[PDB]
Design a protein around this nucleic acid. Sequence first.
RNA 1: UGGAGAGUUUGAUCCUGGCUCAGGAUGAACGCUGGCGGCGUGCCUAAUACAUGCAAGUCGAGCGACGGCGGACGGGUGAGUAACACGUGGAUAACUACCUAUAAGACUGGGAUAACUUCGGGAAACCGGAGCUAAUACCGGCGAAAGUGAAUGUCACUUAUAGAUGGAUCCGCGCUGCAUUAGCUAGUUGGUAAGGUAACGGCUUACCAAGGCAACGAUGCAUAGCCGACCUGAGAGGGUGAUCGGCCACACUGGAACUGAGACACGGUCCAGACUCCUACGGGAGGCAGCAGUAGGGAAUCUUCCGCAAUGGGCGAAAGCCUGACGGAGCAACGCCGCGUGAGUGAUGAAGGUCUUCGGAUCGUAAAACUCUGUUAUUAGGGAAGAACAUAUGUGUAAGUAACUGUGCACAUCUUGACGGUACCUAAUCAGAAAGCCACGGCUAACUACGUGCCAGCAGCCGCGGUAAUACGUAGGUGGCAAGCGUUAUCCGGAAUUAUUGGGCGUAAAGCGCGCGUAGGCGGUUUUUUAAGUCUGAUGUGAAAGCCCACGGCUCAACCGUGGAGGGUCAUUGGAAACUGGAAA
Lengths: 136, 76, 76, 198
Amino acid sequence: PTINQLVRKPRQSKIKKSDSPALNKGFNSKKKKFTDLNSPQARGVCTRVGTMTPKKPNSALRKYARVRLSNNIEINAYIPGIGHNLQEHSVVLVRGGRVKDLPGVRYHIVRGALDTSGVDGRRQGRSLYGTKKPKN
Amino acid sequence: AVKIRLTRLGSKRNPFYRIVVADARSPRDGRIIEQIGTYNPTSANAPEIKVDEALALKWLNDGAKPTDTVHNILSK
Amino acid sequence: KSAIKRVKTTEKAEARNISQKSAMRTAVKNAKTAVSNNADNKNELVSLAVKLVDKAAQSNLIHSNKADRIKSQLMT
Amino acid sequence: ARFRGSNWKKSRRLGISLSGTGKELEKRPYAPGQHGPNQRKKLSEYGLQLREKQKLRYLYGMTERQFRNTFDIAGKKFGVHGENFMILLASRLDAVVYSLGLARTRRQARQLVNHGHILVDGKRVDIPSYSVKPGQTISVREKSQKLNIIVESVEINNFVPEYLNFDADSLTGTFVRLPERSELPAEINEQLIVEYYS
RNA sequence: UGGAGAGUUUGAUCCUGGCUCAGGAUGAACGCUGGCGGCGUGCCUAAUACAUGCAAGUCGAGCGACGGCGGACGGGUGAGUAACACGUGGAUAACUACCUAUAAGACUGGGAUAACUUCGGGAAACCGGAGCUAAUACCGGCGAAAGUGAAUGUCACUUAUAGAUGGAUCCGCGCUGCAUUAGCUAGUUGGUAAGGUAACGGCUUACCAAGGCAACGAUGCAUAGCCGACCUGAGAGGGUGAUCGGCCACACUGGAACUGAGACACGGUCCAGACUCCUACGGGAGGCAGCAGUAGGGAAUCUUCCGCAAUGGGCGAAAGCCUGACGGAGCAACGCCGCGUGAGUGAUGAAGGUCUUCGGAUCGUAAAACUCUGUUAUUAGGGAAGAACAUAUGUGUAAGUAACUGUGCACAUCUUGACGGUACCUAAUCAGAAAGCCACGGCUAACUACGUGCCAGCAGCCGCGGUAAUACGUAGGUGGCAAGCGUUAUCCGGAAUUAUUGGGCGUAAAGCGCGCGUAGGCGGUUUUUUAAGUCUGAUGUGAAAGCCCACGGCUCAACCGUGGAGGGUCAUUGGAAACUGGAAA
Ligand SMILES: [Mg+2]
Ligand SMILES: [Mg+2]
C-alpha cells in the first residue's frame, strides 16, 4: 500500500510447505545421528505386507508396504511393476511421490537397487522398472 | 621487503606467467601487490620474453630480490 | 624431530634473562626506595646501572628493545 | 554426432522434396508407416515453428545442441538473433564443400572433410562445423585426385552459390564475402525460426 | 538487445480464486544402454577410534671432536561466533628475522662448560657424579658492537636514521528469523589515582560521583563461517556459499605459558578431564579437520603414483640439500565440448511380422548386391617449441687490484625432460569391431489388431477399466533427444499468487463500534538567502579470475591469453539556485 507503511513493515512473503513430509531436514539429534535428512533416497526396512483399496469412486485393489524408515518414523509405500520378492524386514530403496485416490500412502519402492531388485514381466517400459536385455 | 615473482597460471600441460612482486610472506597464488606486465614462456605461436621496465624500477629502489632465472629477462 | 634441540635451548634461555630481569628489578625496586631517601649514596652510580639494565632492555633483549622505556622513563 | 539412414522419411513426413535422404521417390501415394491417407494427421499451432526448426536439423545432419549454440552466434552480429543465423549456417565448412561442387550432398560434404581429403590453407582441418572466416581459401591433401567420388563430382555439376569462387574439379575454393539468404536456402523465413526458441 | 500458455467448481455463463503441468538447474542419487580424442570438478550425511608411509630443516669458508636463520609463511577444515567476523570508505595514541641508500664505529678485558672415557641406578623415558675443551656461544668497564674463507676484495656484527614490507586499533555506513520476550546491565556509566601493554584504555584495582542502553528493536532464545563470485530472471528481484582467489577463526576436550623480529603455536609445551593400549604393573608413550589409503553412519564422492626439470618459498657466497607447495599421472558418462558408428552408386513393394475380402498394405533400394573410403582404429618408429638459466670456463660492467666476488648488463653454447619408444605421424588383411532410451487420450510431439476387460493395474490434474479400452502389458508403427535418454528430492521462472517497477476492501478474503489525542507522516501563497537532499564537473578508490564486448592459437570448440566494459545509498574538491528543507519579512 502506502510507501510509509511499506517502510514500517515489508512484504513477508507466502511460506510454502513440502508436499512429501517425512524426508529432507535436520531432525532431532540425540548425541548420534538419531534421525537425519534424506533428500532423494534412503534405505528402508519393512514391517508389513500391504493390501488396500482406493476410496473415492474407485474399487480396485492395491499392494503397499507399511514400513518404518531409517529415521524412526512410519510411512506407507508402493511396489511398481509385477514381481514381489519382498517379505517383512527387507531393505528397500525409496523415492518420493504420492499416489492419488489412496487415502494415506506415500512413496515408490525403487525396483532397481534393493531387495526390490529387478522386475520381470515388462519388456518395453524398462528403466522405470529395472529390467534388462543385453542383446540390445 | 618485496621479491619479484612469476604467478604461474595455465591449464593442463600448458603453463603461463604474469610478472608480479610481493614479499615471500605472501604465497605464489595470490595476495600479489603489483604487476609490471605479462610473461610468455612458450615460444611456438607465442612470444618468449615480455616485461615493462617503467614500473619495474619503482621496486628496485626500495629493495627487490629477483630470482636468478627471472634476472635473465632484465639482462636482455 | 629437530625441535628437540630447540627445547634444549628453551630450558637454557630461561636462566639468563630471569637472572638479568630479577636483578634488573630489585636494583630498581631498591632505587625508588633510594629515591625515597635521596642521600646520593645508595641512589647514585647504580641508577645508571639501573638504567644500564634498562639499557639491557637492548642488551638482554628478552625485555624488548622498543620496550626499553617502560620503567626508566621517570627516575632519570 | 551424425545422422544416418537414407530412408525418405526425412522428406515425405516433413513434406519438402529437397536433396536429402534420397532425391527420388517411389512410394509416392503414402507417407511413411501406416500414417497415410488412411490414418491420423496430427497438426498443431506450435507445429508451424516446429517445422521451421525440424526443416533444417536433418539438412546439415546436426543435433539440437548445435542450433542453440549457433542461434546465439548471430547474437554477436548487429542483427537480431534470428536474422544472421541462416548466414552462419551458410558459412560452415560443410555446406561450402557442397557449394564448391566437390561433393554430391551436404552429407557427402561432411564425409570428405573429416577423412582429411579436403583441407584449408594447407593445414589439416577435419571439422564439419568449422566456420569459414572471410579471407580464407579451401585446400586438399596430395591424395585427392585418384578418388572416384571426387571424379563423380567432376562428372556432374551440382550447386552454384553467389558468395564464392566456383571450382568443381580443381578442389580449391575462395570465400569472397559473407552470404545472404536465398543463396544456400530457398524456402525459409527468418521469422518462424526464432519463435520456437521462446 | 526480446516479456507465450493449457487444464479443472455450473445444465450452461462472466468473475474472484486456489491447486496442477510443460522449461532452465544439481561438486545429485538411482533406473537401462555403452565408441571416446580432449577439458574440469569428485565428504554435502556419526566432529564415528585413526594401522602403515612421507610433510622442516639447513650449515664441515661458525666452532669443536652445538652457535646461528627457519618450524609465526606454506598445505587441511567449518563445531564455533549475528560480530568492526566480514564488506566499504575515513583516522594516528606507537610496532620490522627481513629488504635496503649514505655515514659513524666495528675497541678493550675475562672466566663457566655439551659431544667425548671412567662413575653408579633403572627393562625402559635414561639419569645423578667426575676429570677434558673451544665457540661468531657467555660476561666486566598533539649505551652495545664477530669474525670467518677458495681469487687484503668479499660477508654477517652495531647505532641513529627513513623508504618499502608487516601487523595492530578505536570510527561512519552494509550485515538472518522472532516482539506469543520488554526492560537491561552493575565496575555497569564517569571523573580521579598510581600501576599496567607497541600505544589509548574500567586495561585490571581504590575513596568519591548517579549515570549507560532502549519501541529508531536495547536485552534473551533457535538457525549461520563471511565476501569476489555461482543460480535463475525481461529486468527489478528470489534462492545459494563448492571447488577458485582475499580475510577469518579452530587442532580428541578445557586452561596456561615459555624462545624470539610482531606465536598463546596443527605437526612443539607443563598441567586437568574422558578415552585407546603396553611395562619388571615403580612408570612412560600416542594426537593423519598434512598427502593418500583403511575403518564408520550411510541412498553418495577416487591412487597407499614416480618425482624438483619449470614457477614460488627457508637456509649458504656455491655445488646442492629436505619440499605430499607444486610440475604430472592412476580411477569413476561426474559436467560441458568436439567427434565418429559411414556416405556416392543401388525398383522388381526380394525373404518375412502383426493388421486384411489376407479382392490386400506397411516398414522398404530398406534388406540382397554393387562401389569407393580407413577421421577413428585390432602394425611399429623417427620424435615438442614447454629449458631460460644457475655453476663459470670461454672477457664484459666497478672495488676489476680481482670478468675469482653479489651480478653473470659477448654467449652463458664441453651442460639440465620421471612423465615421454608422449602431443604428433606414416604404412598395412579388413565397412568389417563401434548405439541406444523414453513416449505416442487432451495438454504435447507421436496410432493401430487382439489378449485380460472397475482385475494385474495405471495416474502431474480431467482420470481411461463393470466384459478389449486410440488413456493397461505385447509385436508392428511413429515422435523426441542422441553416448546419452527418463524418474526422484530440492531451488528459481510459469505465479500480477506479497504486486517499489506491477494488486486489492458495497455484496467475492479484507474499513477498527466510535470521539478527544502524544510522538510521527504530510503540509497553501510570497520574496530573499543557506546548500542540507537533488543536479553535474574533477580526483582517488571498490585488486586478480567469471559472465558478456572482441582475436593470433589448441586441426574448430570447451578452457588459456590481451583489451574492453562492469563498484558510490561513499568520503572529499568546484559551479546552479527550480521544487522538498533549517533561517529574515
Ligand atoms: Mg604440509
Ligand atoms: Mg595436491
